[PDB]
Amino acid sequence: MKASRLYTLVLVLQPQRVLLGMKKRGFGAGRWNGFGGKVQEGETIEDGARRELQEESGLTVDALHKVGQIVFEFVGEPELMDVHVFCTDSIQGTPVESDEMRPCWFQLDQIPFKDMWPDDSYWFPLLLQKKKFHGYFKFQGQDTILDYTLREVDTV
Ligand SMILES: Nc1[nH]c(=O)nc2c1ncn2[C@H]1C[C@H](O)[C@@H](COP(=O)(O)O)O1
Ligand SMILES: [Mn+2]
Ligand SMILES: [Mn+2]
Ligand SMILES: [Mn+2]
């Protein structure tokens, strides 16, 4: 049994495009990803997701909907990353570059999978189909999956 730390991941998914951020520094730098980060003490997971979306993309939203949960394990790290995944189609304002992220829209036939975390190739398609999911991925380093599980669920 391991301990796990809570993180959020937020996808702004519209009918024909999705907003991703190019991670400019830190964990997973150089990859397009959803917006998010560690949940802080006192806030709900959803509100932590809203906070990180605002900080990293400039977008304020009143609500997010939970679409999945993914646990990440890295060789040599005893702590698991428990990532709660949220979506919304409804945004106010324009995305703004932050120190952490450069936001960019992608058409839904141009999802940049080769420049995203490898796990996204497995669970992102479920997100696009408006399905809910639970996943687990064990990584050697940043590039290599050694074991994983992915399951569609009716309730996250
Ligand atoms: N394997 C992975 N696939 C993915 O799509 N996002 C990941 C990830 N591993 C971590 N993340 C996300 C979760 C958080 O939004 C963020 C890690 O927290 P910060 O580096 O503090 O933003 O990266
Ligand atoms: Mn952050
Ligand atoms: Mn943070
Ligand atoms: Mn972050």
Give 35-81 as a 3 state SS string.
Answer: ECCECCCCCCHHHHHHHHHHHHHCCECCCCEEEEEEEEEECCCCCEE
- 101: enclosing H helix or E strand: strand 101-107
Q: What is the resolution of this structure in A?
A: 1.2
What are the binding residues?
Answer: 8, 23, 27, 33, 35-38, 52, 55-56, 100, 117-120
Rg (CA), the chain: 15
Residue 79 and residue 5: Cα distance in Å, rounded? 7
* Distance from the alpha carbon of residue 48 to the mean position of ligand 4, in angstroms: 11
* Best CA proximity match to 101, nearest among 24, 28, 20, 11: 24
Give the count of domains, the chain: 1
The partner residues of 135 in beta bridges, in order of sequence, read 70, 150
Per residue in 2-34, is it b (16+ CB within 10 Å) or e — as a string? eeeeebbbbbbbeeeebbbbbbeeeeeeebbbb
Domain span holding position 156 = 1-156
Experimental technique? X-ray
**Ligand 1, atom 21, residue with closest C-alpha:** 37
**Ligand 1, atom 4, residue with closest C-alpha:** 117
